[PDB]
Design a protein around this ligand. Structure first.
Ligand code: PI
Ligand code: PI
Length: 240
């Protein structure tokens, strides 16, 4: 329940393939096979990111969601490409249980409110993708590649105000490094919101999950290290 497995996928020669290391590594593993494995290992939720859709605002990859839905009984978080109200409806109709949004929310924060006021707050996860810039935490869109000029402290406050239910807090610089979560970013964010925080990016071992919880994370997300060591999913699942 505190364990989210983030699966990043892309069509490669007609096949849905799994990507790790912040979308830089084609693992050669099929989405089909990895989804089956992650549930078997004990994950509580799946964050399903269609890496081709991120930042594009063209809609969620509902083909990918429909593909995955009969493979698993786990809640699915649709991620990548949300741009308007109708996009969320399509995601739910494809089988998603919650929806995640970054780029279009930054550009139009009232979208968060629109979603929450229809599909509640708990169905809405706002993905915050941040890093240190000139000594301050700043917010980025398009998976971290595009600046906004918005401070993390400001955005966190706004996100809750607009009615999000959960924050997915990704440290751009930690993703795929397996070097630990950005616990200073987490600690920074914790007293700014009452919302459940999902720590994202950098998990490499069991003690990393511990430090994240200690810094204030309510749930933890794992991609790269889980693919390399699926039993890690079980160990953390059996613990929290
Ligand atoms: O597309 P996104 O993931 O929402 O930024
Ligand atoms: O891959 P990740 O996100 O670092 O877990």
């Amino acid at each position: 329940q505190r364990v989210v497995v983030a699966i990043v996928a892309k069509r490669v020669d007609g096949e849905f393939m799994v990507f790790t290391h912040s979308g830089k590594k084609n693992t050669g593993i099929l989405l089909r096979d990895w989804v089956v494995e992650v549930e078997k290992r004990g994950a509580g939720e799946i964050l399903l990111t269609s890496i081709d859709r991120v930042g594009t605002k063209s809609g969620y990859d509902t083909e990918m969601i429909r593909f995955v839905r009969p493979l698993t009984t786990l809640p699915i978080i649709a991620s990548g490409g949300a741009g308007k109200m109708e996009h969320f409806l399509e995601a739910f109709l494809a089988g998603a249980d919650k929806v995640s949004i970054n780029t279009a929310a930054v550009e139009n924060p009232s979208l968060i409110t629109q979603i929450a006021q229809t599909f509640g707050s708990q169905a809405v996860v706002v993905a915050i993708v941040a890093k240190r810039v000139d000594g301050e935490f700043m917010v980025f869109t398009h998976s971290g590649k595009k600046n906004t000029g918005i401070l993390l402290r400001d955005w966190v406050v706004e996100v809750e105000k607009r009615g999000a239910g959960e924050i997915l807090l990704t440290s751009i610089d930690r993703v795929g490094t397996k070097s630990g979560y950005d616990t200073e970013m987490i600690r920074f964010v914790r007293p700014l919101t009452t919302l459940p925080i999902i720590a994202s990016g950098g998990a490499g071992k069991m003690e990393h999950f511990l430090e994240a919880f200690l810094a204030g994370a309510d749930k933890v997300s794992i991609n790269t290290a889980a693919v390399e060591n699926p039993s890690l999913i079980t160990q953390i699942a059996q613990t929290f």
